[model samples]
Target: YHFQSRRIDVDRDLESVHRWLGHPKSHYWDMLNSSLADVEKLIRDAGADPDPRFGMRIGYFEGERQFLFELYNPLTSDLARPGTGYVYETGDIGMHLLVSSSERRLPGFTGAVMLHIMRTAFFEAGARRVVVEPDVRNADVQRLNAAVGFRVAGDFPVPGKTARLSYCTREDFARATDNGRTLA
Candidate 1:
């Protein structure tokens, strides 16, 4: 139930963040044609942009050495390729939950804990809505979003892939919290 935030100081965490992104199993989106240098430069450039507010940053529990997530906010967000903006237009914020070993499953109450953290993150970022694209094929995640209060906003192709889309809003997030469940 502890989520800690860190603005990635490239001088310190860039390589590890790059490694986490390119890891064989999870770097699916960027691996298409991206080299590690490509990834590294993207991170560097992400920090350069002044728009799309918070760019690439990582989050984890205070005592945990392993990072639990990578969030691509306006200031720190870095998409795999060129041309795409780090943050989405339409006033939405995004995040990529880096799957890790220890948090494989944290049980029923875990959903509530996550919801609070996300709500906190969203407001902290000054976002009106928060959107996530968790591979349309990822029914589990889709279900989790639904459980949290996000109704299916629409279906679109994943940014540059075949994956389906999932979108959520602060309205949905608020309603979900009222119901005692997380956003659906």
Candidate 2:
């Protein structure tokens, strides 16, 4: 699990990020048909957000960008706005993640990347509980979330979609990954 991630840079990542978000499987992002200019606007807008609460990171595996994710402070994010107000516990952080897609998939690769993200969120990011609110119909991602110990809390509204709120405490992740102290 030699995964490494760094803050996303618009100039350096526009093309790749655009392509990934435009993929057939990126319907969840609502950018499957977005033009390059449109994507640039989106990325730039995220960067230009007034609150520093939102963060974007690009993950690398074997030196190639394999995924992209957003980390947001739920207390101040839209999820916590008027609609379906969500109360956040201390150290709670919300995440939105997507893996690069294609038929040249690697076996178990996505799981490894996700585990790496979980570790980063818990260990490096100091999050006591990692939150996720993927679209309700995103069954594929929910399965992955469950595999890593995320349990659904409820379904709620996020500006443009219905989200399935889920959470994973540090202990939950440890239980799923510790596997009885086996040697690496």
Off by over 4 Å in 1: 32-35, 65-90, 101-117, 158-160, 179-184
Give the C-alpha lDDT of model 1: 0.55
Which model scores highest in lDDT? Answer: 2
lDDT of each: 0.55, 0.78
lDDT of 2 by residue, 8-66 (tens): 89889988988899887888888998898998887766655555545788998778888
Model 1, poorest ten-residue lDDT window? 77-86
Pairs clashing within candidate 2? none
Clashes of 1: 25
Give the Cα-based TM-score of candidate 2 against the true structure.
0.85
For each of the candidates, give the backbone clash count.
Answer: 25, 0
lDDT by residue for model 1 (53-96), tens: 54655555555434434344533333323443223565566655
